[PDB]
Amino acid sequence: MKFTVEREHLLKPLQQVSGPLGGRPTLPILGNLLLQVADGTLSLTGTDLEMEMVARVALVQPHEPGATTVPARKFFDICRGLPEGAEIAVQLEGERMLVRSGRSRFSLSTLPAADFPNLDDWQSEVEFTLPQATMKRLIEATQFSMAHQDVRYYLNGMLFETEGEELRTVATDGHRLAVCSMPIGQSLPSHSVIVPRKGVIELMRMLDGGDNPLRVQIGSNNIRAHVGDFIFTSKLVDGRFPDYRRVLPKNPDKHLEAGCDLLKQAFARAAILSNEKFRGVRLYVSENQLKITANNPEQEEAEEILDVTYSGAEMEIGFNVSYVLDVLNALKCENVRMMLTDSVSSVQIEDAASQSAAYVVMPMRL
Amino acid sequence: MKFTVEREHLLKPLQQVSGPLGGRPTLPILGNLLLQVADGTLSLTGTDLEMEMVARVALVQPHEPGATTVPARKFFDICRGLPEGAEIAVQLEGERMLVRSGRSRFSLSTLPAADFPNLDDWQSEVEFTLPQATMKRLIEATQFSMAHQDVRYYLNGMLFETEGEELRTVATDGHRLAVCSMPIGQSLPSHSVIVPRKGVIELMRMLDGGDNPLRVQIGSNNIRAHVGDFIFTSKLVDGRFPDYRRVLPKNPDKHLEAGCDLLKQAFARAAILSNEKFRGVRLYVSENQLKITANNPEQEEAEEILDVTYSGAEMEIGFNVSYVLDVLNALKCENVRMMLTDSVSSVQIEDAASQSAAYVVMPMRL
Ligand SMILES: [Ca+2]
Ligand SMILES: [Ca+2]
Ligand SMILES: [Ca+2]
Ligand SMILES: [Ca+2]
Ligand SMILES: [Ca+2]
Ligand SMILES: [Ca+2]
Ligand SMILES: [Ca+2]
Ligand SMILES: [Ca+2]
Ligand SMILES: [Cl-]
Ligand SMILES: [Cl-]
Ligand SMILES: [Cl-]
Ligand SMILES: [Cl-]
């Protein structure tokens, strides 16, 4: 195996296939990158045995086919540390990979490519394309509502659902939920899968905000995403994910509208004097007014009063203010709508000018 | 006690006296800010019993004299959380301190000002002034060479020495040393003191880069620095701080000059394949050439060759590459001079254009 590639044509793929900072790995070889030269292409692969990242680099300079594996971080750091425009010449010498550029020389330990884990081929059952910006919006809208290392593994992931011409994400941890839907202009089969946290992170990381579209393929136990000359694949998560349709309050009779930032800053200040564990705040809604209160065990108290748009019946309700602040921070908009029912029911929160995303927060008895 | 102050006039002082995050106070009340209204001035004080930060703010709106203490972080966060232009009205009502602005109300728990530790008065023995830029230069030149939680506490601090018309800082961890001297245009007595790590951090934090000169007072066991309407005091550290004059190599006549960035990038690449614990690299100097090599226990190897300016005798020497990189990162200059003796002696490193700072690194047997 031999190749010579310009620094700039290696750096991006090497970064693409790096994956998360974890370790120590199950096998030593999982800390290595698989390098394969065949048919005029260098392929670079990283895996943790469940997800896999593969980049392809066309080789315009002379090259010889073959494969090896090398320490991923060291190889990347070497390439990154070389000067702009550097010609990175790679070859094998016994059990080492030689990397040479100008008067810089490196010798890295290898492990056999034949020993690198090859995940099984699988069959696509659902396929669609969408802009990178749409995937970005879908994941960012909901990601914060995924559970955190819950024993119910399925809540730690994110639902991806096709219905009609829309892709939808749902995330929930039992206490609050987020759902976002976006049209992608294709007739889709009705289907849903659960992508694990680590897969969601990589789906986000692979977006570069350039013009390449995202091509997705869903199998029975896997999902693949292609962007340019990069492929990411992840296992799916088993389990039945909650139906968002059952979580949206059935028929909220009361609607409140307010400036997002004004509302956010009022909750943020009140939150300072809320219980550090339970984070409870109380809302009192009245004609065009919201009063927010908070107190903690040492009897410190916050009160905020705001003008808002509200003509419904007066009511009182408690919420975990972190959950509310999470939502207002994910809504990146001028005005918000809160859809209420009563003090023992959930609230739905949305951009006042868009129903693309909805958020549900359950009340607290206070 | 009563005052009303405009938010932006309160925020800077509150931040000035906040001190470090991640605090373990040795008395609960040290988590509180001391507020004192007297003679038309609000003073704000924070302390950990060893250092103390005091800000004074002139009160142009009605006020009433008195003192109390309140949780520091909550008070700051409340004021920071209020909108731009907010007027903050504060009133002490027994066990509670009321903080109100617009339609935002807060009540904070108080502890009596009478219970707030008052550090003893002490006598200045050495005094001088200097531009803030000179203090910044002196600290930034040497701070990185202080030890990291060494059991010899003096090594964790920074020596401040007056000699002639110069102020000098020295920092060392027992293996590498940094020293920087700057003229301050005043005839000084000969004196040296050790400022603890936390004091160095605050000396740096209190610089605003404005025209306010730094006024320094040194006593037998304390130091004080005044800038504008802010005073910082720190206890000094006991111990026998190393004499930099004995650490500088006596006759380092073999002088090598090289571009800082080229030297740095070569060391940074070689470092990748150095021992992760011991970080050893070897330097081979010869006419107008430097070769750097590194290897680790897996027998991975790096080699770098650069052109340099060198007409001395040939020699090799081993160094901890992290220490060398730390120096080159601190220098921020075009060219560097390395001043060598032999394979069992230390190296002195300087900006080739300035002798105001010097750095010493001990050799390694490799
Ligand atoms: Ca990588
Ligand atoms: Ca070389
Ligand atoms: Ca495969
Ligand atoms: Ca999962
Ligand atoms: Ca209404
Ligand atoms: Ca005032
Ligand atoms: Ca009190
Ligand atoms: Ca005092
Ligand atoms: Cl190329
Ligand atoms: Cl370079
Ligand atoms: Cl400060
Ligand atoms: Cl030579």
PDB file of N, CA and C in Angstrom, chain A residues 4-77:
ATOM      1  N   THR A   4       0.245   9.206  -1.919  1.00  0.00           N
ATOM      2  CA  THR A   4       0.696  10.554  -1.591  1.00  0.00           C
ATOM      3  C   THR A   4      -0.469  11.486  -1.852  1.00  0.00           C
ATOM      4  N   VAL A   5      -0.921  12.176  -0.814  1.00  0.00           N
ATOM      5  CA  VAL A   5      -2.062  13.064  -0.919  1.00  0.00           C
ATOM      6  C   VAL A   5      -1.710  14.387  -0.262  1.00  0.00           C
ATOM      7  N   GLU A   6      -2.269  15.469  -0.788  1.00  0.00           N
ATOM      8  CA  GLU A   6      -2.111  16.786  -0.178  1.00  0.00           C
ATOM      9  C   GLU A   6      -2.834  16.862   1.151  1.00  0.00           C
ATOM     10  N   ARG A   7      -2.169  17.478   2.128  1.00  0.00           N
ATOM     11  CA  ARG A   7      -2.689  17.633   3.480  1.00  0.00           C
ATOM     12  C   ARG A   7      -4.151  17.988   3.506  1.00  0.00           C
ATOM     13  N   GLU A   8      -4.528  18.944   2.669  1.00  0.00           N
ATOM     14  CA  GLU A   8      -5.872  19.487   2.700  1.00  0.00           C
ATOM     15  C   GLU A   8      -6.929  18.474   2.240  1.00  0.00           C
ATOM     16  N   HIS A   9      -6.539  17.501   1.410  1.00  0.00           N
ATOM     17  CA  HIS A   9      -7.466  16.456   0.971  1.00  0.00           C
ATOM     18  C   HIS A   9      -7.564  15.261   1.938  1.00  0.00           C
ATOM     19  N   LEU A  10      -6.695  15.213   2.952  1.00  0.00           N
ATOM     20  CA  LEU A  10      -6.774  14.204   4.015  1.00  0.00           C
ATOM     21  C   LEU A  10      -7.463  14.713   5.271  1.00  0.00           C
ATOM     22  N   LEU A  11      -7.198  15.965   5.614  1.00  0.00           N
ATOM     23  CA  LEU A  11      -7.650  16.524   6.880  1.00  0.00           C
ATOM     24  C   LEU A  11      -9.135  16.408   7.115  1.00  0.00           C
ATOM     25  N   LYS A  12      -9.930  16.845   6.147  1.00  0.00           N
ATOM     26  CA  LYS A  12     -11.377  16.795   6.288  1.00  0.00           C
ATOM     27  C   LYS A  12     -11.879  15.342   6.484  1.00  0.00           C
ATOM     28  N   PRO A  13     -11.494  14.401   5.593  1.00  0.00           N
ATOM     29  CA  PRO A  13     -11.916  13.003   5.811  1.00  0.00           C
ATOM     30  C   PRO A  13     -11.452  12.408   7.140  1.00  0.00           C
ATOM     31  N   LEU A  14     -10.212  12.692   7.528  1.00  0.00           N
ATOM     32  CA  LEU A  14      -9.685  12.188   8.782  1.00  0.00           C
ATOM     33  C   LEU A  14     -10.513  12.714   9.951  1.00  0.00           C
ATOM     34  N   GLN A  15     -10.863  13.994   9.914  1.00  0.00           N
ATOM     35  CA  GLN A  15     -11.734  14.566  10.933  1.00  0.00           C
ATOM     36  C   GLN A  15     -13.123  13.929  10.862  1.00  0.00           C
ATOM     37  N   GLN A  16     -13.634  13.723   9.652  1.00  0.00           N
ATOM     38  CA  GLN A  16     -14.967  13.139   9.493  1.00  0.00           C
ATOM     39  C   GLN A  16     -15.055  11.774  10.168  1.00  0.00           C
ATOM     40  N   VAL A  17     -14.000  10.973  10.052  1.00  0.00           N
ATOM     41  CA  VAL A  17     -14.039   9.595  10.554  1.00  0.00           C
ATOM     42  C   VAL A  17     -13.525   9.431  11.995  1.00  0.00           C
ATOM     43  N   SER A  18     -13.138  10.525  12.643  1.00  0.00           N
ATOM     44  CA  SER A  18     -12.578  10.481  14.007  1.00  0.00           C
ATOM     45  C   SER A  18     -13.526   9.944  15.087  1.00  0.00           C
ATOM     46  N   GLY A  19     -14.788  10.352  15.050  1.00  0.00           N
ATOM     47  CA  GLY A  19     -15.757   9.896  16.047  1.00  0.00           C
ATOM     48  C   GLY A  19     -15.491  10.493  17.423  1.00  0.00           C
ATOM     49  N   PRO A  20     -16.276  10.079  18.429  1.00  0.00           N
ATOM     50  CA  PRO A  20     -16.265  10.778  19.714  1.00  0.00           C
ATOM     51  C   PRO A  20     -15.057  10.447  20.590  1.00  0.00           C
ATOM     52  N   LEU A  21     -14.742  11.349  21.518  1.00  0.00           N
ATOM     53  CA  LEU A  21     -13.680  11.126  22.501  1.00  0.00           C
ATOM     54  C   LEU A  21     -14.188  10.203  23.614  1.00  0.00           C
ATOM     55  N   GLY A  22     -13.850   8.918  23.515  1.00  0.00           N
ATOM     56  CA  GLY A  22     -14.276   7.911  24.490  1.00  0.00           C
ATOM     57  C   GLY A  22     -13.064   7.215  25.079  1.00  0.00           C
ATOM     58  N   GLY A  23     -12.909   5.928  24.772  1.00  0.00           N
ATOM     59  CA  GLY A  23     -11.754   5.149  25.223  1.00  0.00           C
ATOM     60  C   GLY A  23     -11.770   4.856  26.720  1.00  0.00           C
ATOM     61  N   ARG A  24     -11.014   3.854  27.178  1.00  0.00           N
ATOM     62  CA  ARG A  24     -10.256   2.939  26.319  1.00  0.00           C
ATOM     63  C   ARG A  24     -11.214   2.037  25.532  1.00  0.00           C
ATOM     64  N   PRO A  25     -10.873   1.720  24.266  1.00  0.00           N
ATOM     65  CA  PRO A  25     -11.755   0.872  23.461  1.00  0.00           C
ATOM     66  C   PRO A  25     -11.763  -0.602  23.887  1.00  0.00           C
ATOM     67  N   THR A  26     -12.799  -1.322  23.453  1.00  0.00           N
ATOM     68  CA  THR A  26     -12.946  -2.764  23.697  1.00  0.00           C
ATOM     69  C   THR A  26     -11.716  -3.532  23.214  1.00  0.00           C
ATOM     70  N   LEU A  27     -11.370  -3.304  21.949  1.00  0.00           N
ATOM     71  CA  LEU A  27     -10.194  -3.872  21.313  1.00  0.00           C
ATOM     72  C   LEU A  27      -9.216  -2.724  21.089  1.00  0.00           C
ATOM     73  N   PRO A  28      -7.910  -2.989  21.223  1.00  0.00           N
ATOM     74  CA  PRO A  28      -6.917  -2.001  20.821  1.00  0.00           C
ATOM     75  C   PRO A  28      -7.136  -1.468  19.399  1.00  0.00           C
ATOM     76  N   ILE A  29      -7.468  -2.357  18.466  1.00  0.00           N
ATOM     77  CA  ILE A  29      -7.567  -1.983  17.049  1.00  0.00           C
ATOM     78  C   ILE A  29      -8.680  -0.973  16.769  1.00  0.00           C
ATOM     79  N   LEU A  30      -9.651  -0.862  17.672  1.00  0.00           N
ATOM     80  CA  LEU A  30     -10.704   0.144  17.546  1.00  0.00           C
ATOM     81  C   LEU A  30     -10.210   1.572  17.747  1.00  0.00           C
ATOM     82  N   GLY A  31      -9.013   1.739  18.297  1.00  0.00           N
ATOM     83  CA  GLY A  31      -8.383   3.048  18.339  1.00  0.00           C
ATOM     84  C   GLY A  31      -7.649   3.381  17.046  1.00  0.00           C
ATOM     85  N   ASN A  32      -7.691   2.466  16.076  1.00  0.00           N
ATOM     86  CA  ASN A  32      -7.037   2.659  14.799  1.00  0.00           C
ATOM     87  C   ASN A  32      -8.007   3.028  13.677  1.00  0.00           C
ATOM     88  N   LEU A  33      -7.436   3.702  12.687  1.00  0.00           N
ATOM     89  CA  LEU A  33      -8.128   3.977  11.429  1.00  0.00           C
ATOM     90  C   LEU A  33      -7.737   2.911  10.416  1.00  0.00           C
ATOM     91  N   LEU A  34      -8.727   2.415   9.680  1.00  0.00           N
ATOM     92  CA  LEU A  34      -8.485   1.469   8.594  1.00  0.00           C
ATOM     93  C   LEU A  34      -8.223   2.276   7.327  1.00  0.00           C
ATOM     94  N   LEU A  35      -7.082   2.032   6.687  1.00  0.00           N
ATOM     95  CA  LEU A  35      -6.753   2.659   5.410  1.00  0.00           C
ATOM     96  C   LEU A  35      -6.734   1.601   4.321  1.00  0.00           C
ATOM     97  N   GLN A  36      -7.449   1.863   3.234  1.00  0.00           N
ATOM     98  CA  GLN A  36      -7.551   0.931   2.114  1.00  0.00           C
ATOM     99  C   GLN A  36      -7.373   1.670   0.791  1.00  0.00           C
ATOM    100  N   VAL A  37      -6.400   1.229   0.000  1.00  0.00           N
ATOM    101  CA  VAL A  37      -6.232   1.720  -1.356  1.00  0.00           C
ATOM    102  C   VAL A  37      -6.722   0.647  -2.321  1.00  0.00           C
ATOM    103  N   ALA A  38      -7.690   1.023  -3.149  1.00  0.00           N
ATOM    104  CA  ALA A  38      -8.172   0.166  -4.241  1.00  0.00           C
ATOM    105  C   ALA A  38      -8.775   1.032  -5.321  1.00  0.00           C
ATOM    106  N   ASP A  39      -8.540   0.642  -6.567  1.00  0.00           N
ATOM    107  CA  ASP A  39      -9.238   1.225  -7.699  1.00  0.00           C
ATOM    108  C   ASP A  39      -9.148   2.761  -7.721  1.00  0.00           C
ATOM    109  N   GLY A  40      -7.968   3.304  -7.430  1.00  0.00           N
ATOM    110  CA  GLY A  40      -7.773   4.759  -7.410  1.00  0.00           C
ATOM    111  C   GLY A  40      -8.386   5.557  -6.259  1.00  0.00           C
ATOM    112  N   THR A  41      -8.832   4.871  -5.204  1.00  0.00           N
ATOM    113  CA  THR A  41      -9.475   5.525  -4.057  1.00  0.00           C
ATOM    114  C   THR A  41      -8.842   5.073  -2.749  1.00  0.00           C
ATOM    115  N   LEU A  42      -8.573   6.036  -1.871  1.00  0.00           N
ATOM    116  CA  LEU A  42      -8.240   5.753  -0.484  1.00  0.00           C
ATOM    117  C   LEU A  42      -9.524   5.816   0.323  1.00  0.00           C
ATOM    118  N   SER A  43      -9.816   4.740   1.042  1.00  0.00           N
ATOM    119  CA  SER A  43     -10.953   4.709   1.959  1.00  0.00           C
ATOM    120  C   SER A  43     -10.414   4.751   3.384  1.00  0.00           C
ATOM    121  N   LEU A  44     -11.028   5.590   4.206  1.00  0.00           N
ATOM    122  CA  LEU A  44     -10.645   5.732   5.605  1.00  0.00           C
ATOM    123  C   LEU A  44     -11.855   5.399   6.461  1.00  0.00           C
ATOM    124  N   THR A  45     -11.710   4.414   7.345  1.00  0.00           N
ATOM    125  CA  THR A  45     -12.816   3.937   8.167  1.00  0.00           C
ATOM    126  C   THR A  45     -12.506   3.956   9.668  1.00  0.00           C
ATOM    127  N   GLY A  46     -13.459   4.444  10.457  1.00  0.00           N
ATOM    128  CA  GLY A  46     -13.430   4.300  11.916  1.00  0.00           C
ATOM    129  C   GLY A  46     -14.692   3.584  12.380  1.00  0.00           C
ATOM    130  N   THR A  47     -14.588   2.779  13.441  1.00  0.00           N
ATOM    131  CA  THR A  47     -15.762   2.106  14.014  1.00  0.00           C
ATOM    132  C   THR A  47     -15.627   1.868  15.517  1.00  0.00           C
ATOM    133  N   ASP A  48     -16.769   1.738  16.186  1.00  0.00           N
ATOM    134  CA  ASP A  48     -16.802   1.275  17.581  1.00  0.00           C
ATOM    135  C   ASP A  48     -17.510  -0.081  17.705  1.00  0.00           C
ATOM    136  N   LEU A  49     -17.696  -0.745  16.558  1.00  0.00           N
ATOM    137  CA  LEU A  49     -18.403  -2.040  16.421  1.00  0.00           C
ATOM    138  C   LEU A  49     -19.905  -1.904  16.191  1.00  0.00           C
ATOM    139  N   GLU A  50     -20.477  -0.743  16.494  1.00  0.00           N
ATOM    140  CA  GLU A  50     -21.910  -0.497  16.265  1.00  0.00           C
ATOM    141  C   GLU A  50     -22.156   0.589  15.217  1.00  0.00           C
ATOM    142  N   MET A  51     -21.391   1.677  15.279  1.00  0.00           N
ATOM    143  CA  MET A  51     -21.459   2.699  14.245  1.00  0.00           C
ATOM    144  C   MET A  51     -20.145   2.723  13.472  1.00  0.00           C
ATOM    145  N   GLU A  52     -20.213   3.193  12.231  1.00  0.00           N
ATOM    146  CA  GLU A  52     -19.060   3.188  11.344  1.00  0.00           C
ATOM    147  C   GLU A  52     -19.060   4.479  10.529  1.00  0.00           C
ATOM    148  N   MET A  53     -17.872   5.025  10.297  1.00  0.00           N
ATOM    149  CA  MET A  53     -17.688   6.264   9.550  1.00  0.00           C
ATOM    150  C   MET A  53     -16.678   5.950   8.438  1.00  0.00           C
ATOM    151  N   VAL A  54     -17.065   6.176   7.188  1.00  0.00           N
ATOM    152  CA  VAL A  54     -16.208   5.866   6.035  1.00  0.00           C
ATOM    153  C   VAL A  54     -16.120   7.045   5.080  1.00  0.00           C
ATOM    154  N   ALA A  55     -14.898   7.469   4.775  1.00  0.00           N
ATOM    155  CA  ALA A  55     -14.670   8.541   3.825  1.00  0.00           C
ATOM    156  C   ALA A  55     -13.860   8.002   2.654  1.00  0.00           C
ATOM    157  N   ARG A  56     -14.160   8.499   1.455  1.00  0.00           N
ATOM    158  CA  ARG A  56     -13.426   8.132   0.237  1.00  0.00           C
ATOM    159  C   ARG A  56     -12.677   9.338  -0.336  1.00  0.00           C
ATOM    160  N   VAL A  57     -11.398   9.135  -0.661  1.00  0.00           N
ATOM    161  CA  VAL A  57     -10.553  10.171  -1.242  1.00  0.00           C
ATOM    162  C   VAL A  57     -10.006   9.682  -2.583  1.00  0.00           C
ATOM    163  N   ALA A  58     -10.342  10.367  -3.672  1.00  0.00           N
ATOM    164  CA  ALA A  58      -9.764  10.042  -4.979  1.00  0.00           C
ATOM    165  C   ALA A  58      -8.260  10.316  -4.957  1.00  0.00           C
ATOM    166  N   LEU A  59      -7.490   9.388  -5.501  1.00  0.00           N
ATOM    167  CA  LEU A  59      -6.044   9.493  -5.530  1.00  0.00           C
ATOM    168  C   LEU A  59      -5.577   9.899  -6.921  1.00  0.00           C
ATOM    169  N   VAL A  60      -5.188  11.167  -7.068  1.00  0.00           N
ATOM    170  CA  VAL A  60      -4.696  11.671  -8.356  1.00  0.00           C
ATOM    171  C   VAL A  60      -3.185  11.486  -8.538  1.00  0.00           C
ATOM    172  N   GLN A  61      -2.460  11.291  -7.441  1.00  0.00           N
ATOM    173  CA  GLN A  61      -1.036  11.012  -7.515  1.00  0.00           C
ATOM    174  C   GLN A  61      -0.828   9.505  -7.517  1.00  0.00           C
ATOM    175  N   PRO A  62       0.376   9.045  -7.915  1.00  0.00           N
ATOM    176  CA  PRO A  62       0.699   7.618  -7.947  1.00  0.00           C
ATOM    177  C   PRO A  62       0.426   6.906  -6.623  1.00  0.00           C
ATOM    178  N   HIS A  63      -0.019   5.660  -6.712  1.00  0.00           N
ATOM    179  CA  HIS A  63      -0.459   4.927  -5.543  1.00  0.00           C
ATOM    180  C   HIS A  63      -0.363   3.443  -5.827  1.00  0.00           C
ATOM    181  N   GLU A  64      -0.321   2.650  -4.760  1.00  0.00           N
ATOM    182  CA  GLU A  64      -0.299   1.186  -4.835  1.00  0.00           C
ATOM    183  C   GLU A  64      -1.352   0.625  -3.884  1.00  0.00           C
ATOM    184  N   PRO A  65      -2.121  -0.372  -4.340  1.00  0.00           N
ATOM    185  CA  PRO A  65      -3.223  -0.864  -3.517  1.00  0.00           C
ATOM    186  C   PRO A  65      -2.754  -1.628  -2.299  1.00  0.00           C
ATOM    187  N   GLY A  66      -3.648  -1.777  -1.335  1.00  0.00           N
ATOM    188  CA  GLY A  66      -3.327  -2.480  -0.112  1.00  0.00           C
ATOM    189  C   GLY A  66      -4.011  -1.808   1.053  1.00  0.00           C
ATOM    190  N   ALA A  67      -3.843  -2.381   2.236  1.00  0.00           N
ATOM    191  CA  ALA A  67      -4.539  -1.886   3.402  1.00  0.00           C
ATOM    192  C   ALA A  67      -3.721  -2.080   4.670  1.00  0.00           C
ATOM    193  N   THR A  68      -3.964  -1.205   5.642  1.00  0.00           N
ATOM    194  CA  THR A  68      -3.355  -1.303   6.950  1.00  0.00           C
ATOM    195  C   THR A  68      -4.225  -0.565   7.950  1.00  0.00           C
ATOM    196  N   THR A  69      -3.862  -0.635   9.225  1.00  0.00           N
ATOM    197  CA  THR A  69      -4.504   0.208  10.225  1.00  0.00           C
ATOM    198  C   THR A  69      -3.434   0.878  11.052  1.00  0.00           C
ATOM    199  N   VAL A  70      -3.731   2.101  11.481  1.00  0.00           N
ATOM    200  CA  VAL A  70      -2.812   2.889  12.293  1.00  0.00           C
ATOM    201  C   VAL A  70      -3.544   3.655  13.386  1.00  0.00           C
ATOM    202  N   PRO A  71      -2.819   4.026  14.455  1.00  0.00           N
ATOM    203  CA  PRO A  71      -3.400   4.863  15.513  1.00  0.00           C
ATOM    204  C   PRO A  71      -4.044   6.120  14.931  1.00  0.00           C
ATOM    205  N   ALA A  72      -5.336   6.297  15.185  1.00  0.00           N
ATOM    206  CA  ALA A  72      -6.126   7.308  14.502  1.00  0.00           C
ATOM    207  C   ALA A  72      -5.745   8.727  14.927  1.00  0.00           C
ATOM    208  N   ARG A  73      -5.645   8.946  16.230  1.00  0.00           N
ATOM    209  CA  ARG A  73      -5.363  10.268  16.739  1.00  0.00           C
ATOM    210  C   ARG A  73      -3.955  10.724  16.342  1.00  0.00           C
ATOM    211  N   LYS A  74      -2.973   9.832  16.448  1.00  0.00           N
ATOM    212  CA  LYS A  74      -1.600  10.172  16.081  1.00  0.00           C
ATOM    213  C   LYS A  74      -1.500  10.494  14.595  1.00  0.00           C
ATOM    214  N   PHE A  75      -2.131   9.684  13.750  1.00  0.00           N
ATOM    215  CA  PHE A  75      -2.071   9.947  12.323  1.00  0.00           C
ATOM    216  C   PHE A  75      -2.711  11.292  11.987  1.00  0.00           C
ATOM    217  N   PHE A  76      -3.874  11.572  12.580  1.00  0.00           N
ATOM    218  CA  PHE A  76      -4.524  12.850  12.369  1.00  0.00           C
ATOM    219  C   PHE A  76      -3.656  14.011  12.858  1.00  0.00           C
ATOM    220  N   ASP A  77      -3.109  13.881  14.060  1.00  0.00           N
ATOM    221  CA  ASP A  77      -2.320  14.966  14.637  1.00  0.00           C
ATOM    222  C   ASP A  77      -1.079  15.244  13.788  1.00  0.00           C
TER     223      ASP A  77
END
